[PDB]
């Protein structure tokens, strides 16, 4: 399992420019609650929760807060039992 | 590191009959068995059979109307799209029969949401897909 | 199934043919050696003719009379190729003009008689369709309603005996036949010429190495003493070889060793894994020559099955096979036809299983796990039916130490019930 | 983006025999029945059946008078009226004969409000609106 938490920041001259952008973002990422990792559609992140802290620096900080996880198997291309032969005795 | 996928529990889509529910938030049913355990002589071990199967189900969420509550003791039918978004395999279970263990008429604290919470007994399920 | 090369002048040349529980002469092996298979009650018997490579099917062809020039609409021809005299006889009915009587014979006595009204495709299916008629097929020649050409006692010609040569290739012909499919047992027809059974041992020996543990049964001739005997016995020491020893006596005709090494197969067959031959009373009337305690134990000593009349009833001595001249590792119970079979049925089994995980599977310790314990609960099913008192199946670490990724390698080893 | 609405607990209104109750915090009712199950003699699937039902109810809130202590045992009435706000389809339902299955005469401790409890049991419910 791989969590990131990932801050996002939304610059802007006019600010109900920013707070406009930020809400359809999160709402976007809300109702489609995952991400195509890549363009293979193999992986998908997956939201467990945005926050949008609107009093945070617009450059330092960042005002949105989004946390992603992702679950991935461990690959294992082991050798194969092509053959399995056997012999007898009493 | 090849891809996996858990089955998020927000993708339930559950229909009591045969019209969509919104509100449910968790929902239960097993599908249960008599074990019928029986000694022999001579054998140590105890040996289990099948018996007569039992289902049971639960419902949690908030309340929007009074459907429960109309629904009385009838008879309904329950079935749960559980989607799957990574690869689109929808597991699909139909229960038959199913029965109000009893009407949740009123339950609500002063503070908080009002939530029904409902349970009762399916007589068998149809798995539908998967 | 029972490998049968019968050298009969009767039987399908050049394909494996099954009969169920239904030739007829003794001059044929379909009769004088499938009567040994059949009367073992072996569930079902497969069989294979031996015949000369010059040989075919006799024809008859037959001409029309309603038209006054005659043509042919009507031939015929034997069910399976030989020279035997087939005669056919085709007389106007007395009654109907239109009609006439198809009198069929073997040699002389009347095989069938039956009379069509003329349409040439219900007399096909007439001489076809009837039971008296497996010894001959009508075919067609035209399409036209008209009655035939009086005749009487026709000769089927242009073919030859099935009999007409015992020869080495004209023996191994039927034994390439074998190869494409499996059998139980094979039994190489009663002939005692040496070179045949080598040719068999090798031919066995090469489908061993493809996993075919088809069992061969074998004999010497009449004229091997008992010291021959022992010495065409011991000649062979393969698992699934065996040489009957004795003649016997059933009806009429002294069996060599080989030919009733035909009625023990169908003994061995149709015991299934539970019995045995070892001690087992056989329809045959008399053995010769007779055989004392020490000439039966120097016998089985050679490798020799040997049959004696120590009873009221001809009693095989023992289950033994062309091994029982055996090595110190491998036990005398490795020396038993019921076991070998047992052991062959195994190794059955055991391709399936390895056809049933056909590299899906990796070579890791779970993978190893996965088959070892599926080979375990087939053998715990086998020991719950009490064929196996116990066994232990394991890695086959000598193996598996130098076995590359795609290759794995496991053992068995189980006991099973004695009965002297 | 759709509007919904969550029926927030502090809307009830409990009318207890005529006179509406003011200082409750949560109320339960439910409408048991016993499901009688029977185990048919070829099929291999339990059957229920609706059975009896029996009602069963309790408040709590905050003691402001000796009103259950004074009612009894006493048959009685219970109402709740569960309003909607966002749309004003209030929820109504009628308890028929409730009887409180024990008389709660003292519950306090030193430092804390003195809170009442009750429970008991109603013979039937109407379900008066929706």
Redesign the interface.
Known sequence: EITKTMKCHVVSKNKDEIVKLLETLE?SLI?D??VRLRED????L?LVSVVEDRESDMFTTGQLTAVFKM??????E????????????? | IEEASFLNGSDVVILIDGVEELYMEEIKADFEQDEQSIKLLGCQNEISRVGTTKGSFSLNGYKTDSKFAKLGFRSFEIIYNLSNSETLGYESIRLKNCRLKKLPLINSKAGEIVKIEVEGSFRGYDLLNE | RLAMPIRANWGDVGKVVTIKNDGDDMNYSAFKLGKLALLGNVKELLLYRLVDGNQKKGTLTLKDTTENSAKDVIKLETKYPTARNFNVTIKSNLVDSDKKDFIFFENTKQLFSSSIKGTIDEIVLEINSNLDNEYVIATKVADSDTILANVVNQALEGGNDGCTSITNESYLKALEEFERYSFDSFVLDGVADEALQETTKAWVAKNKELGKDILLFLGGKTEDNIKQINDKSKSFNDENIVNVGSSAYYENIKYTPSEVAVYIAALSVSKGITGSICNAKTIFEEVEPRLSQSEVKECLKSGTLVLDFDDGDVIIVDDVNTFKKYVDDKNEAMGYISNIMFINTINKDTSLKRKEFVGKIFNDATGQTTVICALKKYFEELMSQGIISEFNVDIDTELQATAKADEFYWKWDAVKVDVM
Not at chain 1, 41 to 44: I, T
Not at chain 1, 71 to 76: A, E, T, V
């Open positions: 709402t109702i609650k995952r559609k193999n992986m998908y997956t679950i991935g198997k461990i690959k294992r082991g050798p194969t039992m092509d053959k399995i032969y056997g012999n007898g005795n009493l």
